[PDB]
Symmetry: C3
Subunit: 127 residues, 3 copies
């Protein structure tokens, strides 16, 4: 999985190092990926480049996860739940200020180490 995190620069920049650890722990625990396979991109946004509802706070976080298609509905829902729980518990950011979107990609639409994703023999199960 690839993660892309968007947030207000003044709020995201102080926490992004620990947020990276937290999010990676969630994908290890729920998706059973190798602890080594952390691919994260952070986009701290200027105030004028980020609009969110006036009843949310500036802690508002958008998390996009690009991942191999094929996981069960239950595993995916468990992932969303685990990220909500761990970010809230670690930073006190309310679940109302967190949004998560899973982008599923067929294995054959993904290139890794020079070959299409469906020709990889992975060390874990995509179910």
């Amino acid at each position: 999985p690839q993660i892309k995190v968007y947030g207000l620069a003044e709020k995201l920049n102080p926490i992004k190092a620990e947020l990276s650890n937290i999010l990676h722990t969630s994908l290890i625990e729920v998706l059973q990926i190798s602890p080594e396979k952390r691919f994260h991109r952070f986009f701290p946004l200027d105030k004028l480049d980020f609009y969110y509802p006036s009843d949310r706070t500036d802690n508002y976080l958008i998390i996009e996860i690009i991942m191999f298609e094929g996981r069960s509905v239950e595993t995916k829902k468990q992932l969303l739940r685990d990220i909500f729980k761990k970010v809230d518990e670690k930073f006190g950011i309310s679940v109302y200020d967190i949004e998560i979107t899973l982008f599923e990609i067929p294995k054959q639409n993904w290139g890794i180490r020079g070959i299409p994703g469906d020709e990889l023999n992975l060390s874990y199960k995509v179910e």
Copy 2:
């Protein structure tokens, strides 16, 4: 829906605040979302980070919309047409210079307010 907008910094930055207002009106009117649900991210690009063909002017605008799966084809085409119309009318940007891409995501692949999107009310 979540919107991501891309354009040359010196063209997008003077207009992005008004453009946010226009795009939110369009999503409200066509998709019938509640008027508080504005989620927009803007990406003003340096000229060295943005390549587009010579038949597009420096007004070229890319508008990505990430939304729940489930709208009809007619609703979605009306959204594109409404965005094309309203952005052209408000800013004088030719429709030739506007690109819109809809990323539909199954409801169960979204986490909102702590729960999966297929379980919201």
Copy 3:
């Protein structure tokens, strides 16, 4: 096809102009798109905004290609392999340091030059 490229700023900025030429050539040759249709966006990242595994280098390069659905599996796989080969050959970036992801979008989900993409008469064949 729309291309988005992500890499560390000090590594991506010296190569992005030639890389753009390399990527466009690959899409022309494999997808047979009209050679004027280059749409590329570059995202040079700060060191603190870019996490990748310890068995990758800071040449690590992410390539996202958003394209009309409808190409064959073999054509898409040929696109992946061609980009890997030509990027490796031109810049000496090992193919483990390159990752490619195709985002396929139905034609009616795209607005181009004022109309939905399923109503466009194209100058090439999508498939």
